[PDB]
């Protein structure tokens, strides 16, 4: 023989990374926001987080069955050992992956960079975000590439709390003149559950409790 626990952890991580990349490429048009897999002796459970759940399912689950077949053939899962689910994202406006895909789609419609980025930011803040930051860079005005950044609300850049209070996504958007980079970072609000956000207060905030 059996593989060592170190080797098992490495193998599981590599498998998750590859599955994430495959689902990100396959479901780029849909609001692919993540994947979570649970493994038991009975079978392996794979949950897909997406915005357009119907397209990921397809008609009578055709698309989901094709994805299941792809994963089964690539990783040599035996019959009945793999099952794929699709669940929608609770708040679309707080998902950086969904918003970079939305911004990319608006850009591919030959929309102006400022207009599309401002719409993304407005929708993100409308969904109750603490802040938002959209960066678009590349050949926007001519051969001389320039990088534009649009901001709103507040964002944290330093420490390691920005890895838990801010979510980020970046993609290359391909155009006729060349490559365009799109980045979105959303400062998540505070939710006590932890389903969205980190659920603990900010690391530099002290709140004094009102007495009785």
């Amino acid at each position: 023989g059996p593989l060592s626990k170190k080797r098992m952890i490495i193998r599981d991580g590599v498998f998750y990374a590859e599955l994430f990349e495959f689902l990100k490429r396959e479901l780029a048009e849909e609001g692919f926001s993540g994947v979570s897999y649970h493994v038991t002796t009975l079978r392996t459970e794979i949950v897909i987080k997406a915005t357009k759940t119907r397209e990921v399912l397809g008609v009578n689950g055709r698309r989901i069955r094709e994805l299941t077949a792809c994963i089964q053939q690539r990783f040599n899962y035996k019959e009945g050992k793999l099952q794929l689910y699709v669940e929608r994202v609770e708040v679309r406006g707080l998902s950086a992956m969904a918003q970079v895909e939305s911004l990319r789609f608006k850009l591919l419609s030959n929309l102006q960079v400022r207009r599309a980025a401002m719409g993304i930011i407005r929708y993100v803040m409308e969904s109750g975000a603490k802040g938002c930051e959209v960066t678009v860079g590349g050949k926007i005005k001519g051969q001389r590439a320039k990088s534009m950044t649009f901001r709103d609300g507040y964002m944290i850049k330093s420490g390691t709390a920005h890895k838990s209070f801010v979510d980020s996504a970046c993609r290359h958007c391909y155009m006729r003149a060349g490559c365009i980079g799109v980045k979105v970072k959303i400062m998540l609000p505070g939710d006590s559950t932890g389903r969205n956000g980190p659920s603990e207060p900010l690391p530099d905030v002290i709140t004094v409790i009102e007495p009785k």
């Binding site: 170190k6 080797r7 952890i9 490495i10 599981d12 991580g13 590599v14 998750y16 990374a17 590859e18 994430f20 990349e21």
Partner: protein, 56 residues
């Protein structure tokens, strides 16, 4: 006899030329530790998903 000659040295499967990155099939700057077999650039791109984190 060209079918035997074709890729006969790659048949041996020894050296830097027989191993490639499992993400990008590049044969440079491979990481063999823990049998990762990922090039260092692809590893920097994918380390968080693999499970590693930047501490210390």
């Amino acid at each position: 006899g060209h079918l035997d000659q074709w890729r006969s040295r790659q048949k041996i499967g020894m050296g830097k030329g027989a191993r490639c990155c499992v993400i990008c099939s590049n044969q440079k700057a491979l990481i063999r530790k823990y049998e990762l077999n990922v090039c260092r650039q692809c590893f920097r791109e994918n380390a968080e998903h693999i499970g590693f984190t930047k501490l210390r």
